[PDB]
Amino acid sequence: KHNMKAFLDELKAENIKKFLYNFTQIPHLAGTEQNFQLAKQIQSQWKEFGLDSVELAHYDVLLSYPNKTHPNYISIINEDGNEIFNTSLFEPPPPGYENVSDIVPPFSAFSPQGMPEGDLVYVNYARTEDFFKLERDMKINCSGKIVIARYGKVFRGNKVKNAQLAGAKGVILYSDPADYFAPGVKSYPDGWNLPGGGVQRGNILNLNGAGDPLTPGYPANEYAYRRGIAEAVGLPSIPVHPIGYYDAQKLLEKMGGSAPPDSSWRGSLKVPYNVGPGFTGNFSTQKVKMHIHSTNEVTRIYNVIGTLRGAVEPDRYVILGGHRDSWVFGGIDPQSGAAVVHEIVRSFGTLKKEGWRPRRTILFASWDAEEFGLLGSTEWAEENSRLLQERGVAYINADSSIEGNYTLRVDCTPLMYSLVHNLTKELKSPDEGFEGKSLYESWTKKSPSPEFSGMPRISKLGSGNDFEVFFQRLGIASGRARYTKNWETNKFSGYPLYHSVYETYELVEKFYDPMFKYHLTVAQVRGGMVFELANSIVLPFDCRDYAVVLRKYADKIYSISMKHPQEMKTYSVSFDSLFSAVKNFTEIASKFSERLQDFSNPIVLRMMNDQLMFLERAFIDPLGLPDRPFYRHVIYAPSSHNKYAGESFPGIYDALFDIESKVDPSKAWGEVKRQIYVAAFTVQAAAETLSEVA
Amino acid sequence: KHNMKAFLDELKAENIKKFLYNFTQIPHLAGTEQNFQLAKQIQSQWKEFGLDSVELAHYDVLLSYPNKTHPNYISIINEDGNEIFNTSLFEPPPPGYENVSDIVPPFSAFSPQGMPEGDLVYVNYARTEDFFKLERDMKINCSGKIVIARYGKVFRGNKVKNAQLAGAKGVILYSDPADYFAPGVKSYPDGWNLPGGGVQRGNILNLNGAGDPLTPGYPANEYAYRRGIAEAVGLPSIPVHPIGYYDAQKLLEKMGGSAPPDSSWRGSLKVPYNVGPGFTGNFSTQKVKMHIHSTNEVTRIYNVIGTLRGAVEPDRYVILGGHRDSWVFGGIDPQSGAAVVHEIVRSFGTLKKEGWRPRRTILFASWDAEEFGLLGSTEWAEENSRLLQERGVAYINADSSIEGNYTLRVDCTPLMYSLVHNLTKELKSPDEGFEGKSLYESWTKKSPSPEFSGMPRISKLGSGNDFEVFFQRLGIASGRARYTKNWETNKFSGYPLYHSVYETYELVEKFYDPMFKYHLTVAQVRGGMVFELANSIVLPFDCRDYAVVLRKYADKIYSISMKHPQEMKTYSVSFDSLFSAVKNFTEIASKFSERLQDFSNPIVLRMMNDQLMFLERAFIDPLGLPDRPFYRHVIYAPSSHNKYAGESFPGIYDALFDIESKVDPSKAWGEVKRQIYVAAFTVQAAAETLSEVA
Ligand SMILES: *[C@@H]1O[C@H](CO)[C@@H](O[C@@H]2O[C@H](CO)[C@@H](O[C@@H]3O[C@H](CO[C@H]4O[C@H](CO)[C@@H](O)[C@H](O)[C@@H]4O)[C@@H](O)[C@H](O[C@H]4O[C@H](CO)[C@@H](O)[C@H](O)[C@@H]4O)[C@@H]3O)[C@H](O)[C@H]2NC(C)=O)[C@H](O)[C@H]1NC(C)=O
Ligand SMILES: *[C@@H]1O[C@H](CO)[C@@H](O[C@@H]2O[C@H](CO)[C@@H](O[C@@H]3O[C@H](CO[C@H]4O[C@H](CO)[C@@H](O)[C@H](O)[C@@H]4O)[C@@H](O)[C@H](O[C@H]4O[C@H](CO)[C@@H](O)[C@H](O)[C@@H]4O)[C@@H]3O)[C@H](O)[C@H]2NC(C)=O)[C@H](O)[C@H]1NC(C)=O
Ligand SMILES: *[C@@H]1O[C@H](CO[C@@H]2O[C@@H](C)[C@@H](O)[C@@H](O)[C@@H]2O)[C@@H](O[C@@H]2O[C@H](CO)[C@@H](O[C@@H]3O[C@H](CO)[C@@H](O)[C@H](O)[C@@H]3O)[C@H](O)[C@H]2NC(C)=O)[C@H](O)[C@H]1NC(C)=O
Ligand SMILES: *[C@@H]1O[C@H](CO[C@@H]2O[C@@H](C)[C@@H](O)[C@@H](O)[C@@H]2O)[C@@H](O[C@@H]2O[C@H](CO)[C@@H](O[C@@H]3O[C@H](CO)[C@@H](O)[C@H](O)[C@@H]3O)[C@H](O)[C@H]2NC(C)=O)[C@H](O)[C@H]1NC(C)=O
Ligand SMILES: COC(=O)CCN1CCCc2cc(-c3ccc(/C=C(\C#N)C(=O)NCCCC[C@H](NC(=O)N[C@@H](CCC(=O)O)C(=O)O)C(=O)O)s3)ccc21
Ligand SMILES: COC(=O)CCN1CCCc2cc(-c3ccc(/C=C(\C#N)C(=O)NCCCC[C@H](NC(=O)N[C@@H](CCC(=O)O)C(=O)O)C(=O)O)s3)ccc21
Ligand SMILES: *[C@@H]1O[C@H](CO)[C@@H](O[C@@H]2O[C@H](CO)[C@@H](O[C@@H]3O[C@H](CO)[C@@H](O)[C@H](O)[C@@H]3O)[C@H](O)[C@H]2NC(C)=O)[C@H](O)[C@H]1NC(C)=O
Ligand SMILES: *[C@@H]1O[C@H](CO)[C@@H](O[C@@H]2O[C@H](CO)[C@@H](O[C@@H]3O[C@H](CO)[C@@H](O)[C@H](O)[C@@H]3O)[C@H](O)[C@H]2NC(C)=O)[C@H](O)[C@H]1NC(C)=O
Ligand SMILES: *[C@@H]1O[C@H](CO)[C@@H](O[C@@H]2O[C@H](CO)[C@@H](O[C@@H]3O[C@H](CO)[C@@H](O)[C@H](O)[C@@H]3O)[C@H](O)[C@H]2NC(C)=O)[C@H](O)[C@H]1NC(C)=O
Ligand SMILES: *[C@@H]1O[C@H](CO)[C@@H](O[C@@H]2O[C@H](CO)[C@@H](O[C@@H]3O[C@H](CO)[C@@H](O)[C@H](O)[C@@H]3O)[C@H](O)[C@H]2NC(C)=O)[C@H](O)[C@H]1NC(C)=O
Ligand SMILES: *[C@@H]1O[C@H](CO)[C@@H](O[C@@H]2O[C@H](CO)[C@@H](O)[C@H](O)[C@H]2NC(C)=O)[C@H](O)[C@H]1NC(C)=O
Ligand SMILES: *[C@@H]1O[C@H](CO)[C@@H](O[C@@H]2O[C@H](CO)[C@@H](O)[C@H](O)[C@H]2NC(C)=O)[C@H](O)[C@H]1NC(C)=O
Ligand SMILES: *[C@@H]1O[C@H](CO)[C@@H](O)[C@H](O)[C@H]1NC(C)=O
Ligand SMILES: *[C@@H]1O[C@H](CO)[C@@H](O)[C@H](O)[C@H]1NC(C)=O
Ligand SMILES: *[C@@H]1O[C@H](CO)[C@@H](O)[C@H](O)[C@H]1NC(C)=O
Ligand SMILES: *[C@@H]1O[C@H](CO)[C@@H](O)[C@H](O)[C@H]1NC(C)=O
Ligand SMILES: [Ca+2]
Ligand SMILES: [Ca+2]
Ligand SMILES: [Cl-]
Ligand SMILES: [Cl-]
Ligand code: NA
Ligand code: NA
Ligand code: NA
Ligand code: NA
Ligand SMILES: [Zn+2]
Ligand SMILES: [Zn+2]
Ligand SMILES: [Zn+2]
Ligand SMILES: [Zn+2]
């Protein structure tokens, strides 16, 4: 029989391992010839595997590269202008890769050029609250200072935006062992920790969903009109560069001025973590100087798009997508994901060769330039936005399959919760101690839901990956899944070797997943979701699960506002309309679910499959959120303080944030009330898409 | 049999006449008790007629009314401040209505209050080109002047916006006999001409699609957050008032300063039409003073929404809508339309009582507050926008059924051209001399297409009526049809008694349509279109007709740009991408049409009906046109110089308009190129919705 079990049994750990090895021998930086060569290889293999069509979709987008003959670095300079300390020009390459060429040195993509010199201020993680603490409580002024911030806790683009708004003239990012060195594990190559010469690459844009900085709204095709650089979306205005902790120690050790305000500001290095500004007495005349010479350049990128045409509803698309470009070798990010997609394609293609087709069309995507701002997925969705919003059933992302070896991690729309619970109950746990038990059982035991006993934790989608255009701009039901760590060590930093030259095939094979069993489990979860989405007669979405979370989010946002009881009285701020809408959604969703159970009529079916498919769509507001026109989903947006985190009822959340500091409270509370109305209206409108249609 | 012929034969001229009489005995001003009473009557009768559900949908919107105890008027004042001439306080009521109460006196809805005094400037029709002529050629400065403009040629809101941007401190509108008195016909009540005491009411907003000025984007429901008045959409900033030609003659006769620049500036009154400023020598110390005391007030309005549930595709909506509110009695506008809708509902309901249902759902709408800015249709579409954009097949408007008795007028999307040709070939001409001939034949003979022999003229949709939200904001295929005049007399002014107290039942019964045969023909055209849209197995849209017009519009816009060959060379302005997209659309549309002919499979059918339904939808750009976020259709928008007229490729048109006067040509031509890219991209994206789906 050709059923989900046939699909799942065809997936092989050994194949994933072979593909990962194949994808990680050389760097595949976006816009480079090697990444175009890999794109062509994937296109050819997906054709071989049996897909109906496999095309490259190319765009010309703004990318950023260091200057090969004018290297980026940072110095401590003395009063004569002699550079007495220089940060490294490259990470020491790992064993056996010391002759690999075209390893891009560490840099912050899209940094402007410049050579600013000044006194250092240490700003902890450079979060909104770190700058609050500096300016409001400690009275330290960052204006015209170079700030030094540790990576972790929030997306590095938000750190840079925060530093810029504080008046910094430059930003130095570094990896503190507190955040990137797990106690009792060795540094690469003898364990999975970050060595002191290791450095995390990454872009520092604030795109807010825009895609290519030069063509917001429209695909960067051959005849596109581009903005000039001065009007580009999301570029930083001050130079930025990342360093490892050997070099950071040299920059931090001489720091003077004020003490750290508390122990939450101290990392693990043998330094005081003084905030500054500037160095202690002996060295007070020394300064820090950055030298940044990277250039932004419009460069061609290539997505591979594979199609497996649906037998019954070819005009309904279930999308499995993940990126292919990497900073260096991409051992985890993204090739551990891409190897998993390759094996999924292979398995579906085996079934297709035996005569099977899925009910709905499955689209497979190998995205380019994800690392430079989700550019390949966003440009392709801008090109195809009309097809996607009228036909897009679901998008399953497929970046890194592992960031640990402890348990499953799922972030998705509430519409997929029941699908994920059901599927994981049918899959075998790969975990030691759970032999013969379901993935659901092991996952639930290791990662319990905070709300419900006997259920596992499933998080809201945030951002910083290729589902952003599909979910928060276009309103297509989206999900992601990977193996993860126990979050009770170095929390809200990912894995230590993230975006470093040390993220290699050997990292994975030796330290994360030697048997490729976690990879296989992740292929079963991602592939299984795609299979059910593309093949179930009734779409496997439960609208009642949206009703339950909407109430939780409404309680949360109400609780935030209720910290200001006097202002809620003065300005007549009521949440009644939002609770009413959520109550109505709950009642209508319950009734819709009864009809979905209680209806041989393919029009009623497809009518109801359309109501299911368009339910995520109904949370889109075509006017977008304030000053973020590409974040249109009213229930979920990336946190305005951390692109990685999701925020619920983001319009109301941002209206309430730090509201006690606004100069005009009547105007600020007016805007809170405006966002309440928008959210209540959108919830009610979404509910009404589930009512009887006539 | 229950087929279109059964539907059409059930329609009766005598019923339309009875309904028109019933709807026009008292005024039905939006927001008044009498208009709520009529709404309740229509709701009750549509239920009686057999519709499945009939609901009122109410909103609280900004309306505008004169102050009953502080009347609006204009004076000529002398140097002592004695008011030596006053304009009328009311139109002399027609025979037999001299005791009807609650006739709203003439006023310009949404005028601010004020009592400005100053010298008059006569500005012809107050068009963009009239102000160009004044400022650029004649060197007359309107700053701080009261302008007097004749009605006609363009929507009165554009006149006011143009006067405001010229620095006027007030606007006086009047009806010139040149534009509102047809040679050789008598004034009401003895003919259909405007008497000298007659005055045209009408709002002077510039909403650009926004709907209620206080709630752009969202329905004005019970919990809506409203903008303050200062941030409202579209309100004029200077007082405005309309007068008849007896009073205008008194204001114009003393005008001095410069002569009219040419005869296109002279109307029919026995006055010089001097432009001013101010009066001739003897009277140079006299001034004009306005007294405006109207108030804007949030007021409840009521739409009636009737549903006839579809038998096979209940989740597909074909909408017949027209408004019910009137300025006074609404003898033509809108009750000649509403009586026609009432009879259509009656006929469909007769068939329903015999057991028939249409294939798709038909929604019937009696809109409120159309006269105050399309408010009722727009608020309802804002409320239901998600249902309408995923389910809306078509919208047929149904305002005034007659504006003349000469021939048919149709303005619609190209997607309806073939439907209209086919239907009119099956209908009988009501015209004298065409007994036994088709409506198509009489219409084609009297109103030939300018492009094609043996075809009738069908115009682009403009605006100034309730289809605006459905077509230009939401991208639902839309059309309108009515009987019209021969446009070779007083051109681009409508009918003489438009928006006057004289627009009565007797006007229609005595002078326009004594046998109600033109009304019946219009009921057959509107009703027949609805019938085919709601009942044809394959949607009756021909995508090839869009391809033909796209080429015509691309040639037109290219020809405008080619007036500036030097700048097109300097700035590398090419239309190649737009022509390529139009060529592709033509090829893909031809192939789609072959498949539509060449496919028992209801999924392929409905898949292809979805491609047809979503084709108009594909011309929407969710970012809207520049500074007009609610005009989202890239092919059609209301002219930025005249809301009544449609403009094709409006983004490029506005970028090219008066471009030779821009101070920064590189920036201006850059924006032309940007709009070319947007238009070429949107045409190609629309074409690709017609490609094979996978
Ligand atoms: C959750 O779902 C419920 C439906 O079960 C919605 O309930 C509606 O709530 C609104 C209030 O926001 C009600 O609005 C009121 O309507 C009255 C007229 O209603 C009649 O006509 C409608 C046709 O639209 C019928 O549906 C209805 O059954 C009645 O026949 C108005 O008279 C009310 O206005 C008066 O009172 C208010 C409040 O004091 C004053 O401000 C006004 O000035 C005026 O005096 C009022 O507008 C509506 O009737 C309810 N519908 C139903 C079917 O019960 C909730 O709105 C929904 N939640 C959200 C967030 O949408
Ligand atoms: C009307 O419809 C036609 C399709 O019939 C479209 O034609 C496309 O036109 C674009 C130009 O805008 C072509 O783009 C060119 O693609 C080359 C690579 O194409 C290969 O890969 C694609 C996969 O996407 C295949 O479809 C294709 O068959 C080929 O296998 C590039 O190499 C070209 O770039 C080079 O030349 C340009 C121009 O000189 C330089 O600026 C570049 O720097 C570079 O050197 C170029 O990008 C595209 O190939 C065409 N497709 C097909 C199938 O023919 C029209 O675009 C469409 N009109 C509109 C408005 O959309
Ligand atoms: C830190 O690095 C700086 C800069 O060095 C340069 O850039 C780096 C990224 C590497 O690619 C280096 O190889 C590269 O040189 C060092 O300061 C520089 O020192 C050099 C050599 O001593 C100076 O060159 C001199 O140039 C003048 C020309 O007028 C001659 O008089 C001299 O004979 C000599 O050739 C150079 O001027 C100087 N540059 C700057 C910007 O200060 C620095 O020594 C190094 N510090 C360390 C390792 O502690
Ligand atoms: C044009 O109309 C103005 C204003 O008249 C008023 O408003 C109109 C819309 C109508 O509703 C009128 O019925 C209404 O009166 C006329 O000017 C006004 O004339 C009256 C009567 O002569 C003046 O009243 C005077 O008030 C003072 C109070 O201090 C006394 O000294 C007088 O005994 C007398 O009662 C009024 O002040 C004056 N108003 C203004 C604003 O000028 C005007 O006569 C008329 N012109 C015509 C018909 O040619
Ligand atoms: C209900 O739910 C809840 O309770 C919500 C809970 N909740 C609410 C409150 C606190 C909170 C915090 C977080 C996080 C904070 C830090 C996080 C992780 C990192 C940091 N700093 C990090 O760098 N990880 C590396 C892998 C991830 C990026 C990685 N992606 C990329 O590398 N992409 C590129 C390009 C991206 C782009 O340009 O946009 C890049 O980032 O450079 C991946 O996705 O694997 S996640 C998440 C949820 C959360
Ligand atoms: C291919 O095509 C082509 O060739 C396109 C050709 N083409 C291109 C170039 C020249 C041109 C000019 C025109 C016109 C110019 C003036 C016109 C008519 C009037 C004036 N002035 C007028 O007042 N008519 C009264 C009835 C119409 C309004 C009447 N509507 C209302 O009364 N509505 C209210 C509220 C509206 C709102 O608030 O928005 C109001 O207007 O007050 C109706 O629709 O019956 S139409 C049309 C097309 C055209
Ligand atoms: C990753 O795996 C791919 C797919 O197996 C490898 O690419 C493939 O490499 C082989 C051997 O080089 C190619 O076959 C050769 O073809 C040429 C003619 O073009 C011929 O001269 C040789 O004799 C040989 O038959 C094959 O085309 C190619 N397939 C692709 C790109 O689809 C790739 O080498 C692996 N990469 C690494 C780093 O291991
Ligand atoms: C995840 O799995 C659960 C458990 O199987 C699914 O819920 C179950 O769905 C079935 C099929 O629709 C329900 O069966 C129905 O039962 C009623 C009788 O009460 C009958 O009227 C229907 O004809 C039908 O037989 C079943 O009740 C229901 N079980 C529970 C506990 O809710 C669920 O649908 C799955 N989720 C997804 C997204 O697939
Ligand atoms: C326009 O036509 C409508 C519909 O025919 C007229 O309204 C209807 O008027 C009649 C007579 O007044 C109403 O019947 C009456 O009902 C009351 C009880 O409510 C009773 O006291 C009387 O004896 C009589 O039976 C009828 O309800 C009403 N129908 C509606 C509103 O649906 C209306 O009068 C006409 N208007 C004009 C201006 O001619
Ligand atoms: C308006 O009326 C015209 C004329 O009736 C309609 O065009 C006609 O549509 C029919 C039905 O699809 C076409 O018949 C087809 O003919 C081909 C053979 O060439 C065959 O392959 C198909 O199975 C089918 O029998 C017919 O060719 C076509 N006539 C013309 C002159 O184009 C048109 O569809 C109507 N428009 C609307 C919107 O309904
Ligand atoms: C990368 O840096 C080098 C310099 O280290 C740049 O080459 C110089 O560019 C300047 C300014 O245009 C010229 O005046 C010199 O003649 C060049 N010098 C040398 C030594 O080649 C180069 O332009 C930069 N590359 C990029 C892509 O920006
Ligand atoms: C319409 O106009 C009348 C005046 O002709 C207004 O009534 C006056 O309002 C003023 C200012 O608020 C009061 O001081 C007076 O006591 C009122 N005078 C009279 C004679 O009644 C009235 O407010 C206006 N109506 C509206 C709805 O604006
Ligand atoms: C910080 O320093 C700058 C530059 O000297 C100054 O202009 C600014 O006002 C200061 N801000 C605060 C909050 O002290
Ligand atoms: C793999 O699992 C073991 C057992 O818990 C753990 O000690 C080790 O740290 C894990 N490896 C990684 C990379 O997390
Ligand atoms: C018109 O008059 C005003 C007011 O006196 C003046 O400020 C303005 O500059 C003048 N404009 C032109 C174009 O002459
Ligand atoms: C009705 O038609 C006749 C015949 O052409 C014409 O003379 C008369 O003016 C028409 N009435 C109206 C209101 O146009
Ligand atoms: Ca873009
Ligand atoms: Ca509104
Ligand atoms: Cl992922
Ligand atoms: Cl109409
Ligand atoms: Na384990
Ligand atoms: Na290695
Ligand atoms: Na005639
Ligand atoms: Na009359
Ligand atoms: Zn990644
Ligand atoms: Zn990454
Ligand atoms: Zn009207
Ligand atoms: Zn009107």
Author numbering:
A (entry chain A), B (entry chain A): 55 to 653, 656 to 750
Quoted from the paper:
Prostate-specific membrane antigen (PSMA) is a type II transmembrane glycoprotein specifically overexpressed in most PCa with limited expression in normal tissue. Fluorescent molecular rotors (FMRs) are a family of fluorophores sensitive to local microenvironment (e.g., polarity and viscosity). In this study, we aimed at the design of activatable probes by linking a benzonitrile fluorescent rotor to the Lys-Urea-Glu scaffold, a well-established PSMA-targeting moiety used clinically for PCa imaging and radiotherapy.
To provide mechanistic rationale for the fluorescent enhancement of Glu-490 upon rhPSMA binding, we solved the crystal structure of the rhPSMA/Glu-490 complex and refined it to the 1.73 Å resolution limit. The active-site-bound Glu-490 was fitted into well-defined interpretable Fo-Fc electron density peaks in the final stages of the refinement. Positioning of the Lys-Urea-Glu motif is virtually indistinguishable from rhPSMA/urea ligand complexes reported previously. The FMR moiety consists of a distal N-substituted tetrahydroquinoline donor group, a thiophene ring spacer and a nitrile acceptor group. That spatial arrangement prevents the intramolecular twisting motion of the subgroups relative to each other and such rigidity is critical for efficient fluorescence emission upon FMR photoexcitation. The nitrile group is inserted into a deep pocket delineated the main chains of G206–F209 and the Y700 side chain. Furthermore, the FMR ring system is propped against the PSMA surface delineated by residues N698–G702 of the “glutarate sensor”. Here, the most conspicuous are CH–π interactions between the thiophene ring and the Y700 methylene group (4.0 Å) and the tetrahydroquinoline moiety and the A701 side chain methyl group (3.8 Å and 4.1 Å).
